[PDB]
Amino acid sequence: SNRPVMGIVQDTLTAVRKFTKRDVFLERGEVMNLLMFLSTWDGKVPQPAILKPRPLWTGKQIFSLIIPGHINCIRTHSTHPDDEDSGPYKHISPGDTKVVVENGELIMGILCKKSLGTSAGSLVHISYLEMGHDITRLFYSNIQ
């Protein structure tokens, strides 16, 4: 069916969603731990989304380091309403419910089965097609 067979399943998918929500702010030590568990990490700590009150990273900001190469993908979250595409806020979705990955970086959106699962045009499928089998393996393992 020209679809990926393996996908993100069980704890990891629910944790993906809850991690990739907007409200996730990660402290310095937590960021260093999560980067310690990255195998393809280049060793450079990204500049946090929030600087002065305290340095705070975001879940999408660390998920962008998991995403390999320069991958361009657009999906929609399960809870996406059809009203947002019609009126204003098309590109600034209030519920965080459209997915945009540009240049191998997650800009907005909440990931779910429709993005990391086994479906046509998924993020994993696009990663395989762009990067090949060797890099997609590291992509699954790092996410896990």
Partner: protein, 148 residues
């Protein structure tokens, strides 16, 4: 310098769509000088914001005041001469869309800039004359401070 934008904004709404996230609310702000419309997502616990509050918003390419690229890495030890740290709330992000009022036949009169600060989004609409300094896929710093 490297300051792309600077103005003073008035908070008009906080959650018109309802509160969808516990630690993040969406400021709708009008502007008293240039009449630039602003939408911004702000961390509430870290930096509370209330209605009818004057804050000065500065969007800059670099924090170092001198024209030196920041290279986009975290280094808390770098004592360069200033970090433009005269501001209470600082964010870092990238521009991902610049919409316009242009037709096929004539240029844009009003532009809108879409910036994502690690998941937090901002939209800034108004006249294209003062909003020309933005280019997509470029790094942008947000700077805010409350006013009395």
């Amino acid at each position: 310098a490297g300051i792309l934008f600077e103005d003073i904004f008035d908070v008009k709404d906080i959650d018109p769509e309802g509160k969808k996230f516990d630690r993040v609310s969406r400021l709708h702000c009008e502007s008293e000088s240039f009449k630039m419309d602003l939408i911004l997502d702000v961390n509430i616990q870290i930096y509370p914001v209330d209605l009818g509050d004057k804050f000065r918003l500065v969007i800059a390419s670099t924090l170092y005041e001198d024209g030196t690229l920041d290279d986009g890495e975290y280094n808390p030890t770098d004592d360069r001469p200033s970090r433009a740290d005269q501001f209470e709330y600082v964010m870092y992000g990238k521009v991902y869309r610049i919409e316009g009022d242009e037709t096929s036949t004539e240029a844009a009169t009003r532009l809108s800039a879409y910036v994502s600060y690690g998941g937090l989004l901002m939209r800034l609409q108004g006249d294209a004359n003062n909003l020309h300094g933005f280019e997509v896929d470029s790094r942008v710093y947000l700077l805010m401070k409350k006013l009395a």
